[PDB]
Design a protein around this ligand. Structure first.
Ligand code: HEM
Length: 414
């Protein structure tokens, strides 16, 4: 029971007779983790910078009950790696007990070994470095088309739709063999499922997409395409279900496509904030072999991992994480440990900049090679195309939305 006589926070004060206390505990902690992972331009916010100084593992929240659950945040790189690499944490148990089945088939984030291992192993070959090599020429074409469209319009141009989304939509669609004629309507439907203010209309749109995708999966899984479905379906036959394939594909075009768009927008913004450094990339790329890793480290566009649930008591760094506790890992804190300082600042010329922008352990980003391909093609292509790229209005702050790193609009001229 919150006490609204004492405090002002709306989220913490929400109460009505018959409210679920556990739900409120979970939701408040999610809100806290989210607030901590907003950004101050490219930087951690002061609240996270402060929290980081406290130690490598801190309490986000601790339930009203005697012997109730604690939600933890891991910020130290050692603690983050330890939690994410441990077999004593579950991802599945975040969504229900041992009894509860899979809620969203193909949502790998939600599986534990052994079934996480089998499903990921089945879908892995479609996401390989070799497979991305084969995909590069198509990505290069997508990027040039987008730059052509930008140039043809004239500045100012909003790089969120015209760069991030203009690349992410066709790239993710092409990867799944989605016919060119279907892609614009699908992107529109996905927009509605991500943003519509009516939850009812949001669900209708989501269902419309999943219906299309289920049909596409059934059509493609036994055919001869180089799309995800042909590859995985030909290789695995009936061992992978239509629902599992639908789930994987939907993540690629849904959530993951949003991530790529957000990364590309954040990248374009960094280029106009650090033009001398990216001039080095376009004119002498050989002198900056590790530019990609440094950029990923600095940007950390996926600030935090999904909470993991302790399956038994476990020592993390110095603390005791009790069975049933959750730990959320701050990839942002792990990647920016020395913020602020000269050494933390973006430096394109740095030695092999090591980072956890794509996570760690068994759940590490399946699409890392794809995301990297996207970025390694798009950013240099943009730099060469528009060397004079700048903010249309240097006086105006860039508006950032809720995490993950969410550039709402990026008006650039050249
Ligand atoms: C289209 C490109 C992408 C695809 C297809 C993709 C796909 C995936 C999938 C399927 C997972 C779950 C893997 C598992 O649980 O075994 C995952 C995890 C993850 N991805 Fe991506 N991803 C993409 C882009 C990105 C980007 C741009 C970032 C930002 C750096 C990112 C960061 C992460 C992180 C941090 C995790 C681990 C989450 C956790 O441990 O809770 N991904 N990715």
């Amino acid at each position: 029971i919150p006490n609204p006589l004492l405090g002002l926070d709306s989220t913490e004060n929400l109460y009505f007779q018959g409210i679920d206390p556990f739900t409120m505990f979970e939701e408040i902690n999610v809100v806290r983790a989210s607030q901590l992972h907003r950004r101050d331009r490219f930087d951690p916010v002061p609240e996270l910078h402060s929290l980081m100084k406290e130690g490598g593992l801190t309490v986000l929240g601790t339930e009203d009950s005697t012997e109730g659950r604690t939600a933890w945040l891991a910020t130290g790189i050692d603690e983050v790696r330890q939690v994410l690499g441990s077999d004593k944490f579950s991802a599945r148990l975040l969504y229900g007990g041992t009894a509860a089945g899979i809620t969203w088939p193909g949502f790998l984030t939600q599986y534990d070994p052994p079934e996480h291992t089998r499903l990921r192993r089945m879908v892995v070959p479609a996401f390989s470095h070799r497979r991305m090599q084969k995909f590069r020429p198509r990505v290069e074409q997508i990027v040039q088309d987008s730059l052509d469209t930008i140039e043809s319009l004239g500045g100012p141009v909003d790089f969120v739709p015209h760069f991030g989304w203009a690349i992410a939509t066709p790239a993710t669609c092409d990867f799944l063999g989605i016919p060119r004629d279907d892609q614009a309507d699908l992107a529109r439907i996905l927009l509605a499922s991500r943003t519509d203010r009516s939850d009812k209309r949001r669900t209708a749109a989501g269902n419309k997409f999943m219906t299309y995708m289920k049909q596409h999966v059934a059509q493609s899984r036994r055919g001869s395409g180089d799309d995800l479905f042909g590859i995985v379906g030909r290789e695995n036959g009936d061992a992978i279900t239509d629902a599992e394939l639908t789930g994987v594909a939907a993540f690629v075009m849904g959530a993951a496509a949003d991530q790529v768009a957000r990364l590309l927008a954040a990248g374009a913004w960094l280029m106009v904030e650090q033009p001398a450094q990216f001039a080095l990339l376009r004119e002498k790329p050989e002198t900056v072999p590790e530019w990609l890793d440094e950029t990923m480290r600095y940007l950390t566009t996926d600030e935090k991992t999904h909470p993991r649930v302790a399956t038994q008591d476990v020592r993390i760094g110095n603390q005791l994480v009790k069975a049933g506790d959750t730990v959320t890992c701050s990839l942002l804190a792990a990647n920016r440990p020395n913020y602020p300082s000269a050494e933390d600042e973006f430096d394109i010329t740095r030695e092999k900049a090591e980072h956890l922008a794509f996570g760690h352990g068994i759940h590490h980003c399946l699409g890392r090679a794809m995301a990297e391909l996207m970025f390694k093609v798009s950013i240099p292509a943009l730099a060469h195309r528009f060397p004079t790229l700048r903010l249309a209005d240097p006086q105006r702050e860039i508006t950032l939305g809720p995490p993950p790193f969410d550039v709402e609009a990026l008006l650039l001229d050249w």
